[PDB]
Write a protein that binds this ligand. Structure first.
Ligand SMILES: [Mg+2]
Ligand SMILES: [Zn+2]
Ligand SMILES: [Zn+2]
Ligand SMILES: [Zn+2]
Ligand SMILES: [Zn+2]
Lengths: 1179, 56, 69, 45, 56, 48, 159
DNA sequence: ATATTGTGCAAAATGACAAAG
RNA sequence: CUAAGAGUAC
DNA sequence: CTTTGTCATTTTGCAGGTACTCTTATTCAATAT
C-alpha cells in the first residue's frame, strides 16, 4: 500500500492472476500454436526439399544434339490471404465466420507461392564434367496451391483485431474465445495429442524370461529435416546370474544387433582404452569396467575402422552393395541413419560416438542398480501436439504429395514433348481436399478423433473442450494421476468411461510452448565457456557437467553454477525466450535445455535472498500489484503494466515438469516465507520447517481446470465427487453464447433465468461463469419428507416450476439442400402434390406454402413436413397400382422428428458453394421440468425428480418459506459431500447479508465463521430451521437443514428417453427389429438376459421372446437331405427337392430367420447343416 | 442383469407420468438407483408365457 | 436473461424492483443488502431472486435487429 | 410473391420460384422468411 | 452372438425409473403412453366378449 | 465319413452361389466378391 | 415479435403479471361459460403494443397493458402497480426499431391449476413458541436454549 | 463430355537342439 | 440406406 | 544312429452389458469413345 517495496499478501496474487488472464485468455495455446504454424512452419515446409530438378540427358545418337537440359522448379515465399469464398457466378468476396457457419462454407484462405522455373543447359561431352548455364529464361508469378482453413481469432482472421462493438456488428459473441475452425459450417476443435518426447534416452528393465535384462533406447528425431523416427536401442544380454553379459546395439536397416565396440571402432575409435573412456568417465568405477570387459572381448577380433565398417556392411539388410562399397554403405548408414537428431552431415563421428557412450553409460548405471529405470509416466517426458504441429505434419505430407505430382507431370510432359503449363501442373484440390478431409473427419491422414465437433451445450463445456488432451493407447500405467501432473492438468476432471485418465484437461494457468530456434542459446553457451564436444577428453575433465540442448549433447562445462546463473538472468530479462526450460541436475552433473514445442508449463512467483529484510521474500511487492491494479482499472492515464511486464522484469517464471524437479516451491507466501493460540476451526497446516525456497505458487486453487474451478469448496469433498461434478457440469444447461439467436446450431438449450451462484469461487470470474451461468439458486431442504426422494430422487416444488424455475428453450435446426443428380436433374424445393409425386410421407404437407418451407410462427408437431423437396426421375413406368408417367417426381421431404414438436422459430434460405439453393429450419420448444428430469448440485449429487408437490403441500418454516427442492439425507453420509452442506450454509448467509460467498478451495473460511454470521442474522447457527408439515400444519419433531443451493439442470430428460415398440420396421437383412429409438427400434434381448430366463426355467417365454417377438420364419426341408433346398409352391400345393427327387418326404419347420440365414451362409461356405426331424441314435 | 433376480415379473399399474415406478425394496436385487437409471419392460404375448412369468 | 416477474419460492412480485435496485446500487451507493432491505425483500428467497439475477438481455440488445421496421 | 428479409439489410423482398435468392439492395445471399400472417396462440402457463 | 443367442425384440419398452413408496412390492408403474403402445393379444371368449368389445 | 464328409470334398470344384437374400442390395460385399471370382474364373478359362 | 425474447417466454411473463381481482366473483369460469372460446362474461381482454422508436432501450412495462374488453362496471383487469415510479412489472426491452404487438385473454383461476393465480405470496405460521407442547426435539450441541434463537412471538406467551 | 480401370496376455503348437542309449 | 468415427448415460 | 525331453520361439484368439446423440463419406484421375 503506502510502502512500495512491502511484501504482498495472499489476497494480492489474484491481481497477478487477473493480469495473466488479461494477456493470455483461456485458449491462448490454440491460437499461439496456429499463429506459429502460419507464420513460420508453412514457409519451412515450402522451402524444405521442393526443388524439382529434372535432368533430361542429351541421349544423343548423333553429336549434333549433345545438349543436356535440366528443368528445375523452385518455390519461394508463401502468401496467405484473408479468408475469402468463391461463388457460382465466379465473384470472390471476403468471407466472415457468421456467413461460413450459416452457409456451410469453410473459413479458409487461399495460399499462393512464388514459383521460379529455371532451366540450365550443358554440352554433353563424354568424360568431361558437365557445366550447366542459364538460358536467361528465369520466369517467376504467384500460383494458387490450395486453401488453408483459418482458426477463429487467429492472427489471420477477421476477428483478431475486432472490438466488442465490431463483434456485435459482425453477429459474433464477444464471449466467444475462438481457437477452432469452421469446416463446411461445422465448428471443429483439435484435441491436443499426447506423445512421448523425442531425443531422450530412456532405460528400462526387461522381464525375467527375456535374455536381455536392460534396454536403453532413444526415439531420435530431427525437427528441421525429413521428420523421420529412427529408434536406436542398446541392449544388455544375459540375466544377473549369467556370465556372458555382452552389450549390443540395434542400428537401423541392420538385421543383427551389432556389438557396441564394433560400432565404436567403425566410427573411428580403435583403441580399447579410448572406447572405454568414451563410455565410462571414471577410472575408479571398476564395476562398470568389469561389466564392460565382455564387450571388448567380443570385439577383440576386429582391430581396424575399415574392418568394423565392413563387418557392419556385411550385416546390411539392403543386400545391394558390392564388397568394396560396403564400407561406404556402412558409412552412409552411420551418417544419415544413426542418431539423426545429432547431425546428418559428416565429420561428426566423435559426437555420435560420445552420444553412444553416454547411452551405454546410462544403461550400465541402470544395470548396476545405481539408478532406477526411467518412469514412463513422468509428465516432463511427454509432449502435446496442438493444432500447430498436427497441421504441420499433415500439410508436410500433403504438399509432398502435391510436389510429387508436379514432378510426375513435368516428367510426363517433357517425355511426351507436350507444352508445360503451371495451371495444369498444380492441382490445388489436393491440398484443399486433404486439409478439409482431415479436419472434417477425425482421422488425421491421407489416428482418429483428432478433430472433434466443438461442444456448445454450455459455455464451460466449450471452454473445457478447447483445452482437452487425448493420449493414444506398453508396460506403463498411464491412467493414474501422476505426481508430475501437479499444476499442469486438472487433478479431478476426466471421463468415467474407458477414457478415465487417458483424456486430460489443462490447468487454468498451464500453457504449451510453441518452440523456438535453439541456435541463439547454442551461441550463448559457446560464448560463455561451453567446451566443444570434439576436443573433450573425460580424463582431463572428470568433474565436468554435460550440457544438453533438445537432447543433443553439445559439450561440457567446468563451472556450471555461473552458466546456470547467467542463463537464468538472460531468460528473466527476456533475452532468452521464456518458454525455454533449463534444468540443472547436480547429482548427475548434467545441464539440460529444452526449447522444442509441446512442453507444458505453468507460471510461478520468483523468490530471492532480499538481503534488506534478511530472509527470503517474493520478488513481487505492493508496487507492482498497485501498477497492475491501475492498469486493470484503466481498462475497465498511466503506463500499461501487463503480464509481459512481470515476465520481462523477472517477477514471474515459466516452469515445466522437467525444471520443476530441481526447484522448491512454497505453497503460499504469507505463511511459508517469514521465519517462525490458533483457531481450532481452521485446518491444520505444516510450516515445512525449511527456508530454501526458489519459487512460490501464485495460487494453489490454480491447479484445478475449467470445470473443477466451478465447484464450491472442492477441498471439503471426496475426490470422486469432484470428478463427477467436473464431468457433469459440461452437461449443465445455461447460455452457451449470447448470439444464440443468430446461429443455426443443430441443438441448443437455454435457461430462461440463469442465476449466478450465491457461493462463488474467485477463479470463476475469469471463466465468465457469472456472465453466462448454467444453473439456479434453488431453496433446498435436506429431509426425509415423503419417501419419494429415496435412492437419489428429489422432490421439486411444483409452484416453483409454475413460476419459471429451471424452465428452458430448446432449438433444433434441420438442414436441406437441393443437389444436382445430373447436369439438368436439379432437385426442387416445393409443395409436392399427391397427383404427381412418389413416396410422399404420411405426415401432413398442409403447413408448407409454395416454396416448400414452413413460415416462422407456425406450430409443428411430430411427423409433419417442414421442408418440401422433390427429385426428378425417369417417367413412363407403371406399377404399384397408382404409378403413372405423371409421377415424374420422387418425394425427398424432411419431416419433423417423430417425438418432438414446437414452433418453427426461423427459416434461412441461401446458396451453397456449388450455387444450389439450400435451407435451414430452426424449430423452438419449451422444456419444463417434470418427473424424471435429471438435476445435480455442484458436488456430484445427481438425481431425478421423483415427484412434485405444490406449495401448500411442502414443509414450511415459521416465515412461510417453502423449499424449491427436497433431497434425501441418506445421500450425505456415504458420499461424504461436506462441501454441499458448507455451500448451503454459506449461500444462506450470503442471501441474507447481500454479499457473495467466497467458496474458493484453499481460503481460510471456516464453518465456524459462517455459523457465527448466520447466528448474527437471527437464525440457528448450523442452518437448522423448525419446519411444519404441509398436510397437517404440525411441527416436525426434527429440525430441517434448509437453505439456498446452486443446482444445474442436466441434458438428460425423460421425454428424450421414453420409448416403446409393439411392432415396427424390420432390418432388411436379418428380418429383426431395427436399432434405436429414433428409428422405432426394438430393445436388445442380450445373451445374459437369456441366461437369466434360463435360470428362471421359463423355457416357453424364452422361445416366445426369440421367435414370436423377433423373427419367426417357416422353411421347408426334405427328409433325405436335411437342407432347405425344397421348392415349395404353396398355392399349387407342390413341394419338391431337386437332386433327392422326392415330393412327399418334405417337412416344414419354424426357425429364426437369422438361423435360416446362418444355415444358408454355411452352405455358401461349403458346409451342409442337415436338419433332421427324428433321432438316429439313442440318448 | 448379473443374476436371475435382476429380471423379475411385476404387475402392471398404469400411472400418469413418463417414468417406470417400482417399490423401494425391490431396488436391491436390481441394483437400481433413481439418479438416471433406465429399465426395460417385456410383455408376454401368450397365456403360457404369461402364466409361467406369473408363477416362476 | 431478464428479471423474473415473481420469486420462485414464495411468489412475491420482484419484476418491478430491478430498476429500483440498480438505481439504489448506482445512484445512492448502497451495498446490496441494504438495497434489498430497502426494496422490501426480507425473506432470503426474494433476496436471492433479485441478488443473483444476471441481466443478459442487455447483451442480446447489442446485436442489430433481424427484422427492422 | 413470398416475402423474405435480408439477413444484413433487414430490407423486405418478394421472391418468386425462379428469382435468385439475393438481396436487391446489398447483394447479401442470406435471406430469412417473413413471419407468418396466421395468428399464433400461446398458453400463458 | 449378435442375432441368435441375443436379438432385438418387439413388445418391449425402456425408460427412466422412479421410486414409489405407495406401490406394492410386485407392482410396477407404467406410463400411460407406454401402456397405449405395448399390447397383448387376448383371444375372444364368451367370458371376455363384453370387455373386449368395449375396448375395441 | 463315407456319406457326409469325404476328404476330396475339402477341395472346391463347384462354388455354391447364395441367393440374393444372403447378399441383399449398391450391391453387397459378397456380390462383389462373387463378381471378382467369376472374373478370375473367366480369365483362367480363356487363358487355358 | 421482433424482440430478443421468445414468444412463449413473454407469454409466461405476462401470465405472471398480477391483475386486479377485487370483483373476480362476478366473473365466470371459461369452462362453464356458454360462449365458444371467450366472451365478456368470463374474460378480460388486454392488448400490448410497443415499438422501439427511441435510440435508447425502451422498457415495456405492465402499465402499457390496455384493457380492450368492456369491464361492464366491474373492478377487475387493471394491472397492479406497487412501486413509486408508477411503472409496473418490467415485461420486456426493445432496441430501436423492434416491435411487440400482442393480445392477452385473462380468465379466472386458482393457484392449484397454476401458481400464477396465487394471490397469497408467503404466509408465516407459528404456534407454541416456547415448545411447551413438546412438538419438537431441539437439535443441539451444548445447550438447546442458547443455540436456538427465540421467536418474536415468545413475548406473547408466558415462559 | 462421361464411363472405366489402375496389443498384451497366455495357452497351445512347433521347431531347434544338446544329452542319452 | 449402409459404413466408420466421436461424444455420452447407468 | 535315432530318440528324448527341453526350452525358445511362433501362432493366435480375446478382450462387460444395455442405451442415446451427431458427423461424414461413399476411389481420383487419365483416357478413349
Ligand atoms: Mg444409478
Ligand atoms: Zn433333399
Ligand atoms: Zn420470495
Ligand atoms: Zn441486404
Ligand atoms: Zn364466456
Amino acid at each position: 500500500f503506502e510502502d512500495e517495496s512491502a511484501p504482498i499478501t495472499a489476497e494480492d496474487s489474484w491481481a497477478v492472476i487477473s493480469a495473466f488472464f488479461r494477456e493470455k485468455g483461456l485458449v491462448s495455446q490454440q491460437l499461439d500454436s496456429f499463429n506459429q504454424f502460419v507464420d513460420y512452419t508453412l514457409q519451412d515446409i515450402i522451402c524444405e526439399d521442393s526443388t524439382l530438378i529434372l535432368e533430361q540427358l542429351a541421349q544423343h545418337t548423333t553429336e549434333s544434339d549433345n545438349i543436356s537440359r535440366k528443368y528445375e522448379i523452385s518455390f519461394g515465399k508463401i502468401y496467405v490471404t484473408k479468408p475469402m469464398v468463391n461463388e457460382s457466378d465466379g465473384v470472390t468476396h471476403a468471407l466472415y465466420p457468421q456467413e461460413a457457419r450459416l452457409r456451410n462454407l469453410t473459413y479458409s484462405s487461399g495460399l499462393f507461392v512464388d514459383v521460379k522455373k529455371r532451366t540450365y543447359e550443358a554440352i554433353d561431352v563424354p568424360g568431361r564434367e558437365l557445366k550447366y548455364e542459364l538460358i536467361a529464361e528465369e520466369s517467376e508469378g504467384k500460383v494458387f496451391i490450395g486453401r488453408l482453413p483459418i482458426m477463429l481469432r487467429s492472427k489471420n482472421c477477421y476477428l483478431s483485431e475486432a472490438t466488442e462493438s465490431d463483434l456485435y456488428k459482425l453477429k459474433e459473441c464477444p464471449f466467444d474465445m475462438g481457437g477452432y475452425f469452421i469446416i463446411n459450417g461445422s465448428e471443429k476443435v483439435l484435441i491436443a495429442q499426447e506423445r512421448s518426447a523425442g531425443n531422450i534416452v530412456q532405460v528400462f528393465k526387461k522381464a525375467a524370461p527375456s535374455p536381455i535384462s536392460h534396454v536403453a533406447e532413444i526415439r531420435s528425431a530431427l525437427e528441421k529435416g525429413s521428420r523421420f523416427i529412427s529408434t536406436l536401442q542398446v541392449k544388455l544380454y544375459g540375466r544377473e546370474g549369467s556370465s556372458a553379459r555382452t552389450i549390443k546395439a540395434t542400428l537401423p536397416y541392420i538385421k543383427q544387433d551389432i556389438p557396441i565396440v564394433i560400432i565404436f571402432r567403425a566410427l573411428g575409435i580403435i583403441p580399447d582404452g579410448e572406447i572405454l573412456e568414451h563410455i565410462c568417465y571414471d577410472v575408479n568405477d571398476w564395476q562398470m569396467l568389469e561389466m564392460l570387459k565382455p564387450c571388448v572381448e567380443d570385439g577383440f577380433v576386429i582391430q581396424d575402422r575399415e574392418t568394423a565398417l565392413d563387418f557392419i556392411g556385411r550385416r546390411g539388410t539392403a543386400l545391394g552393395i558390392k564388397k568394396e562399397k560396403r564400407i561406404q554403405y556402412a558409412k552412409d548408414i552411420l551418417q544419415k541413419e544413426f542418431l539423426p537428431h545429432i547431425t546428418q552431415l559428416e565429420g561428426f563421428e566423435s559426437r555420435k560416438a560420445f552420444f553412444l557412450g553416454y547411452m551405454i553409460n546410462r544403461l550400465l548405471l541402470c544395470a548396476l542398480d545405481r539408478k532406477d529405470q526411467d518412469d514412463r509416466d513422468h509428465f516432463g517426458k511427454k509432449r502435446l501436439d496442438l493444432a500447430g504441429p498436427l497441421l504441420a505434419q499433415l500439410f508436410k505430407t500433403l504438399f509432398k504429395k502435391l510436389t510429387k505430382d508436379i514432378f510426375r507431370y513435368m516428367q510426363r510432359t517433357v517425355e511426351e514433348a507436350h507444352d508445360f503449363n503451371m495451371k495444369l501442373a498444380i492441382n490445388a484440390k489436393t491440398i484443399t481436399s486433404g486439409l478439409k478431409y482431415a479436419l472434417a473427419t477425425g482421422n488425421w491422414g491421407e489416428r482418429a478423433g483428432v478433430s472433434q465437433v466443438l461442444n456448445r451445450y454450455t459455455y464451460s463445456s466449450t471452454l473445457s473442450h478447447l483445452r482437452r488432451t487425448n493420449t493414444p493407447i506398453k508396460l506403463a500405467k498411464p491412467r493414474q494421476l501422476h505426481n508430475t501432473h501437479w499444476g499442469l492438468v486438472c487433478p479431478a476432471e476426466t471421463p468415467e468411461g474407458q477414457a478415465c485418465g487417458l483424456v486430460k484437461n489443462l490447468s487454468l494457468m498451464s500453457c504449451i510452448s510453441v518452440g523456438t530456434d535453439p541456435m541463439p542459446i547454442i551461441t550463448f553457451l559457446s560464448e560463455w565457456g561451453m567446451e566443444p564436444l570434439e576436443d573433450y577428453v573425460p580424463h582431463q575433465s572428470p568433474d565436468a557437467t554435460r550440457v544438453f540442448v533438445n537432447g543433443v549433447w553439445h559439450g561440457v562445462h567446468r563451472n556450471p553454477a555461473r552458466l546456470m546463473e547467467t542463463l537464468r538472468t538472460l531468460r528473466r530479462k527476456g533475452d532468452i525466450n521464456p518458454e525455454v526450460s533449463m534444468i540443472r541436475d547436480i547429482r548427475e552433473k548434467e545441464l539440460k535445455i529444452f526449447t522444442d514445442a509441446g512442453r507444458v508449463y505453468r507460471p510461478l512467483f520468483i523468490v530471492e535472498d532480499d538481503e534488506s529484510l534478511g530472509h527470503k521474500e517474493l520478488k513481487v511487492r505492493k508496487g507492482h500489484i498497485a501498477k497492475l491494479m491501475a492498469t486493470e482499472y484503466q481498462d475497465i492515464d498511466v503506463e500499461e503494466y501487463t503480464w509481459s511486464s512481470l515476465l520481462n522484469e523477472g517477477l514471474v517464471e515459466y516452469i515445466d515438469a522437467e525444471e520443476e524437479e530441481s526447484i522448491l516451491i512454497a505453497m503460499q507466501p504469507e505463511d511459508l516465507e517469514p521465519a517462525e493460540d490458533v483457531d481450532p476451526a481452521k485446518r491444520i497446516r505444516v510450516s515445512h520447517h525449511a527456508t530454501t525456497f526458489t519459487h512460490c505458487e501464485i495460487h494453489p486453487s490454480m491447479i484445478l481446470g475449467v470445470a473443477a474451478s466451478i465447484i464450491p469448496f472442492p477441498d471439503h469433498n471426496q475426490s470422486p465427487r469432484n470428478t463427477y461434478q467436473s464431468a457433469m457440469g459440461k452437461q449443465a444447461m445455461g447460455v452457451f453464447l449470447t448470439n444464440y439467436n443468430v446461429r443455426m446450431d443443430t441443438m441448443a438449450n437455454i435457461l430462461y433465468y440463469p442465476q449466478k451462484p450465491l457461493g462463488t469461487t474467485r477463479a470463476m470470474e475469469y471463466l465468465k461463469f457469472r456472465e453466462l451461468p448454467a444453473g439456479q439458486n434453488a431453496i433446498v431442504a435436506i429431509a426425509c419428507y415423503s419417501g419419494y426422494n429415496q435412492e437419489d430422487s428429489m422432490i421439486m416444488n411444483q409452484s416453483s416450476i409454475d413460476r419459471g424455475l429451471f424452465r428452458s428453450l430448446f432449438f433444433r435446426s434441420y438442414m436441406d439442400q437441393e443437389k444436382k443428380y445430373g447436369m439438368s436433374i436439379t432437385e426442387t424445393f416445393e409443395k409436392p402434390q399427391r397427383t404427381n409425386t412418389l413416396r410422399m410421407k404420411h405426415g401432413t404437407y398442409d403447413k408448407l406454402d409454395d416454396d416448400g418451407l414452413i413460415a416462422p410462427g407456425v406450430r409443428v408437431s411430430g411427423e409433419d413436413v417442414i421442408i418440401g423437396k422433390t427429385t426428378p426421375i425417369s417417367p413412363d413406368e407403371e406399377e404399384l397400382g397408382q404409378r403413372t408417367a405423371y409421377h415424374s417426381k420422387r418425394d425427398a421431404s424432411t419431416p419433423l422428428r417423430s417425438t418432438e414438436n414446437g414452433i418453427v422459430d426461423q427459416v434461412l434460405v441461401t446458396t451453397n458453394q456449388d450455387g444450389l439453393k439450400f435451407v435451414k429450419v430452426r424449430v423452438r420448444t419449451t422444456k419444463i421440468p417434470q418427473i424424471g428430469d435429471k438435476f445435480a448440485s455442484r458436488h456430484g449429487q445427481k438425481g431425478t425428480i421423483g415427484i412434485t408437490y405444490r406449495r401448500e403441500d411442502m414443509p414450511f418454516t415459521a416465515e412461510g418459506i417453502v423449499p424449491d427442492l427436497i433431497i434425501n439425507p441418506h445421500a450425505i453420509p456415504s458420499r461424504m459431500t461436506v462441501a454441499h452442506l458448507i455451500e448451503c450454509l454459506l449461500s444462506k448467509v450470503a442471501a441474507l447479508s447481500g454479499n457473495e460467498g467466497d467458496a474458493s478451495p484453499f481460503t481460510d473460511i471456516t464453518v465456524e465463521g459462517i455459523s457465527k454470521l448466520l447466528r448474527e442474522h437471527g437464525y440457528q447457527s448450523r442452518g437448522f430451521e423448525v419446519m411444519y408439515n404441509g398436510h397437517t400444519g404440525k411441527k416436525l419433531m426434527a429440525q430441517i437443514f434448509f437453505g439456498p443451493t446452486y443446482y444445474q439442470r442436466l441434458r438428460h430428460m425423460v421425454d428424450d428417453k421414453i420409448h416403446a415398440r409393439a411392432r415396427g420396421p424390420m432390418q432388411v437383412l436379418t428380418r429383426q427389429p431395427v436399432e434405436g429409438r429414433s428409428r422405432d427400434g426394438g430393445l436388445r434381448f442380450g445373451e445374459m438376459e437369456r441366461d437369466c430366463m434360463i435360470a428362471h426355467g421359463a423355457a416357453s417365454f424364452l422361445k416366445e421372446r426369440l421367435m414370436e417377438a423377433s423373427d419367426a420364419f417357416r422353411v421347408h426341408i426334405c427328409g433325405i437331405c436335411g437342407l432347405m433346398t425344397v421348392i415349395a409352391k404353396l398355392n399349387h400345393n407342390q413341394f419338391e427337392c431337386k437332386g433327392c427327387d422326392n415330393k412327399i418326404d418334405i417337412y416344414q419347420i419354424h426357425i429364426p430367420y437369422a438361423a435360416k440365414l446362418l444355415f444358408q451362409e454355411l452352405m455358401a461356405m461349403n458346409i451342409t447343416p442337415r436338419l433332421y426331424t427324428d433321432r438316429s441314435r439313442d440318448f | 442383469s448379473l443374476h436371475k433376480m435382476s429380471m423379475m415379473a411385476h404387475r402392471v399399474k398404469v400411472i400418469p407420468y413418463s417414468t417406470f415406478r417400482l417399490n423401494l425394496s425391490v431396488t436391491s436385487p436390481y441394483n437400481a438407483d433413481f439418479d438416471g437409471d433406465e429399465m426395460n419392460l417385456h410383455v408376454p404375448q401368450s397365456e403360457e408365457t404369461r402364466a409361467e412369468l406369473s408363477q416362476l | 436473461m431478464i428479471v423474473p416477474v415473481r420469486c420462485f419460492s414464495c411468489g412475491k412480485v420482484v419484476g418491478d424492483k430491478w430498476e429500483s435496485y440498480l438505481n439504489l446500487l448506482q445512484e445512492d451507493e448502497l451495498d446490496e443488502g441494504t438495497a434489498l432491505s430497502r426494496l422490501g425483500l426480507k425473506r432470503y428467497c426474494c433476496r436471492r431472486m433479485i441478488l443473483t439475477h444476471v441481466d443478459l438481455i442487455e447483451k442480446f440488445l447489442r446485436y442489430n435487429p433481424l427484422e427492422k421496421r | 410473391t413470398l416475402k423474405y428479409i435480408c439477413a444484413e439489410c433487414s430490407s423486405k423482398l418478394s421472391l418468386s420460384r425462379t428469382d435468385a435468392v439475393r438481396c436487391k439492395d446489398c447483394g447479401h445471399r442470406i435471406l430469412l422468411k417473413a413471419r407468418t400472417k396466421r395468428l399464433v396462440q400461446f398458453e400463458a402457463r | 452372438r449378435g442375432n441368435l443367442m441375443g436379438k432385438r425384440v418387439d413388445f418391449s419398452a425402456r425408460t427412466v425409473i422412479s421410486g414409489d413408496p405407495n406401490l406394492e412390492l410386485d407392482q410396477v408403474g407404467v406410463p400411460k403412453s407406454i401402456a397405449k403402445t405395448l399390447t397383448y393379444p387376448e383371444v375372444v371368449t364368451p367370458y371376455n366378449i363384453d370387455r373386449l368389445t368395449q375396448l375395441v | 465319413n463315407e456319406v457326409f464328409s469325404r476328404p476330396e470334398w475339402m477341395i472346391l470344384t463347384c462354388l455354391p452361389v447364395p441367393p440374393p437374400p444372403v447378399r441383399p442390395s449398391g450391391e453387397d460385399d459378397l456380390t462383389f466378391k462373387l463378381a471378382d471370382i467369376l472374373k478370375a474364373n473367366i480369365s483362367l478359362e480363356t487363358l487355358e | 415479435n421482433t424482440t430478443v425474447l421468445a414468444d412463449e417466454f413473454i407469454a409466461h411473463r405476462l401470465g405472471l403479471i398480477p391483475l386486479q381481482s377485487m370483483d373476480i366473483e362476478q366473473l365466470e369460469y371459461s369452462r362453464d361459460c356458454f360462449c365458444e372460446d371467450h366472451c365478456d362474461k368470463c374474460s378480460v381482454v388486454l392488448t400490448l403494443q410497443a415499438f422501439g422508436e427511441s435510440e435508447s432501450t425502451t422498457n415495456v412495462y405492465s402499465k402499457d397493458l390496455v384493457i380492450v374488453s368492456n369491464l361492464m362496471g366491474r373492478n377487475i383487469g387493471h394491472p397492479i402497480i406497487q412501486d413509486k415510479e408508477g411503472n409496473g412489472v418490467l415485461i420486456c426491452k426493445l432496441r430501436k426499431g423492434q416491435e411487440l404487438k400482442l393480445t392477452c385473454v385473462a380468465k379466472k383461476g386458482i393457484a392449484k391449476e397454476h401458481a400464477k393465480w396465487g394471490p397469497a405470496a408467503a404466509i408465516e405460521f407459528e404456534y407454541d413458541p416456547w415448545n411447551k407442547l413438546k412438538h419438537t426435539d431441539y437439535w443441539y450441541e451444548q445447550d438447546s436454549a442458547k443455540e436456538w434463537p427465540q421467536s418474536k412471538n415468545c413475548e406473547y406467551e408466558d415462559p
